[PDB]
Amino acid sequence: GMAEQMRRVARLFGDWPETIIWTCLEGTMGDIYVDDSQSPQSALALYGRQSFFGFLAGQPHRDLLKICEGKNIILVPQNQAWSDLIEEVYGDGVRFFTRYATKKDTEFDLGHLQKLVDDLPESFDMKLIDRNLYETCLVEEWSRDLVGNYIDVEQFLDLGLGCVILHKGQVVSGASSYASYSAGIEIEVDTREDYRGLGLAKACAAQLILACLDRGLYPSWDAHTLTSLKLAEKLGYELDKAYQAYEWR
Amino acid sequence: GMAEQMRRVARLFGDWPETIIWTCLEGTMGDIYVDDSQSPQSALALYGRQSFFGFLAGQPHRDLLKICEGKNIILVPQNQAWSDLIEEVYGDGVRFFTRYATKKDTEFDLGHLQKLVDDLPESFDMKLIDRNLYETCLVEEWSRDLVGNYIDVEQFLDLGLGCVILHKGQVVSGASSYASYSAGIEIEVDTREDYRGLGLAKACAAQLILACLDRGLYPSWDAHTLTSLKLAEKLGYELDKAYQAYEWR
Ligand SMILES: C[As](C)(=O)[O-]
Ligand code: NA
Numbered sequence: 001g002m003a004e005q006m007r008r009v010a011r012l013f014g015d016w017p018e019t020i021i022w023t024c025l026e027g028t029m030g031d032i033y034v035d036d037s038q039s040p041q042s043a044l045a046l047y048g049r050q051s052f053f054g055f056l057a058g059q060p061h062r063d064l065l066k067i068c069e070g071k072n073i074i075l076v077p078q079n080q081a082w083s084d085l086i087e088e089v090y091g092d093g094v095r096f097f098t099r100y101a102t103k104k105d106t107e108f109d110l111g112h113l114q115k116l117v118d119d120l121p122e123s124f125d126m127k128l129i130d131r132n133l134y135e136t137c138l139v140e141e142w143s144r145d146l147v148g149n150y151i152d153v154e155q156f157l158d159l160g161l162g163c164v165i166l167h168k169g170q171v172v173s174g175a176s177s178y179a180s181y182s183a184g185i186e187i188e189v190d191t192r193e194d195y196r197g198l199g200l201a202k203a204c205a206a207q208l209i210l211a212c213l214d215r216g217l218y219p220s221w222d223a224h225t226l227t228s229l230k231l232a233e234k235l236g237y238e239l240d241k242a243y244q245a246y247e248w249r
Numbered sequence: 250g251m252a253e254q255m256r257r258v259a260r261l262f263g264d265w266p267e268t269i270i271w272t273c274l275e276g277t278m279g280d281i282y283v284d285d286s287q288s289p290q291s292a293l294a295l296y297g298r299q300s301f302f303g304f305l306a307g308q309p310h311r312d313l314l315k316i317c318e319g320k321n322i323i324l325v326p327q328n329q330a331w332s333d334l335i336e337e338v339y340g341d342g343v344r345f346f347t348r349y350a351t352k353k354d355t356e357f358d359l360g361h362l363q364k365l366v367d368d369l370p371e372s373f374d375m376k377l378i379d380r381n382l383y384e385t386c387l388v389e390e391w392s393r394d395l396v397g398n399y400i401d402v403e404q405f406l407d408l409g410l411g412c413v414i415l416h417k418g419q420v421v422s423g424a425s426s427y428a429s430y431s432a433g434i435e436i437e438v439d440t441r442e443d444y445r446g447l448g449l450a451k452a453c454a455a456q457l458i459l460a461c462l463d464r465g466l467y468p469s470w471d472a473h474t475l476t477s478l479k480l481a482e483k484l485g486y487e488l489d490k491a492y493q494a495y496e497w498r
Contacts, residue, residue: 001280001281001293001295002251002254002255002280002282002283002286003255003276003279003280003281004280005251006252006255007276009251024252025252026276027252027255027256027275027276028256030252031250031252032250032251034250034251037251037286044250046250182431
């Protein structure tokens, strides 16, 4: 039946430790597309609402790539074969770049993380994202990914977790669940354009990691850039490996 | 996609606190069948290997009943519309009977449970089911459901949990996981005919519950008979409601 079919699909991804894939495969958020629901040899774990991720596994297949078209999406190939089809089909219509996966067995230095939180200057107020702050994070574009992948505020409060810094009554930095899975969250951090250079996103992240641990959740980091990897390293994460990714040109 | 369709199917079952339905919808064990992949209005949560449950949700649909035919199965209708279809289609070919659901918010008296375990006479030996006892349970029809729903010993040891009472070197009673879900198990208790009426079921049930609680698992009880309900009440469970069930005659 349907459940057996999904078990087969999960095998196409195998041991691919990207928590967003786990989200899609677990069933509550994200979605899964295949070449043939009856005899699946190709799969896509598609996740997001404004920004997206498309993890492509199994046999390279053109139709799954078409699903990803027209979206503010990061395509992640399982292997060179997927990358080859992506380049073959879209050529200049796609932009190759490199992301950095971190190990999922992180040992965190709590004193260090609490220190980062504690060092925050006097006028900056750290808060957990609640019902009202959820909506606040949706107001400006810079902060939307902190909560925008959740269907509504209720799904965020139920399944998400985040924390924001306020300064003079405005949210100016945040760290929150870009996605959630059964045992953790995938972290997103953001700082407003006019509040750079103050270590705000590091402080938020420190706080979110502590809140995750306090709740027995694993806080996952997957870096979009080297600068992002450098910050993860300061938080206690270690690089797993650099990996191929693509975006539409 | 596939995960969205599975979310739609799950809604058909709604708030139905039977853990085997949870097993089937979580994705690891059991399976799910529907009238229409794209427009699901009727669904079947089917679980088992030697004995089975068929939980039927949504609009009554005769094709889902057909999937249950020729199996050692308990059919559980979500509603009276399903019951009416079952009776109409099969007439004297189904036996109608009442099972008793228990509340899932049980407060167990650990002291009481341990006393029941302690009261097992020295003549009897209580043991957790291991690789060898797994095989012993499968050999007799009376004990096979203690472990038989798992694909093999490896799956049973990984996801299941159970214990047995031995006397003169033979397994004479046992309490084990008929099924498992993310946060618990569904209990199966059995006693060999010649050893009934000696309080053995109560002792192994008490031990299993204690084993569950110790591991943070919820030990669920769904009573096949009033006698089973009365046992559950001694163990701390409280009746939720009597409900309709069918078997093939
Ligand atoms: C063996 As029973 C606890 O399902 O009546
Ligand atoms: Na699941």
